[PDB]
Amino acid sequence: GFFSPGIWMGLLTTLFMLFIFTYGLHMILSLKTMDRFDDR
């Protein structure tokens, strides 16, 4: 067979936490700093 109960259950939990990681990283990557500072 292509998949086992072990392998599959692993993949199912892996994807859920992978989506969480993707969500977190997504917002982290879309994070900018300032072009310039306001004043002296």
Binding site: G6, G10, T13, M17, L31, M34, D38
Partner: protein
């Protein structure tokens, strides 16, 4: 009698608790530091007060450390799977909860520091809103801890 792979799910719980919380705190710190850097130029006297958002972000990371270790000290070889998924749930519960809280702390802290410099009367409001953010992370810890022994 132990379904093999039983240990795999558990250890991922410890990993998630630390990694996701670190991601949250890291983002929270990054946003707070950026806001502090922009604010502090004109009003350096607020630098010490402005650090608070960063500390809370750090606390989020600690919640994750607490669960990640609690799970790690709870791992064995002959894990009955039932226990493993409980640990995975606890890990994810605090992880995502801490992750979301870190975002709230960062985004709110950034605005709060900038606003406070313009209007110091907002300082208390900044702190209050941020406490709620931390309380959310705490929530994640509390349930994650409760689940670890069920």
């Amino acid at each position: 009698n132990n379904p093999e792979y039983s240990s795999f799910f558990g250890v991922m719980g410890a990993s998630s608790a630390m990694v996701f919380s670190a991601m949250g705190a890291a983002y929270g710190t990054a946003k707070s530091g950026t806001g502090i850097a922009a604010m502090s130029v004109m009003r350096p006297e607020l630098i010490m007060k402005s650090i608070i958002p960063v500390v809370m972000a750090g606390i989020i990371a600690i919640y994750g450390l607490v669960v990640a270790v609690l799970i790690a000290n709870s791992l064995t070889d002959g894990i009955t799977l039932y226990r493993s998924f409980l640990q995975l749930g606890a890990g994810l519960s605090v992880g995502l909860s801490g992750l979301a809280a870190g975002f709230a702390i960062g985004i709110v802290g950034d605005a709060g520091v900038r606003g406070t410099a313009q209007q110091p009367r907002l300082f208390v409001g900044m702190i209050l809103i941020l406490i709620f953010a931390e309380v959310l992370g705490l929530y994640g810890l509390i349930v994650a801890l409760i689940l670890s022994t069920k």
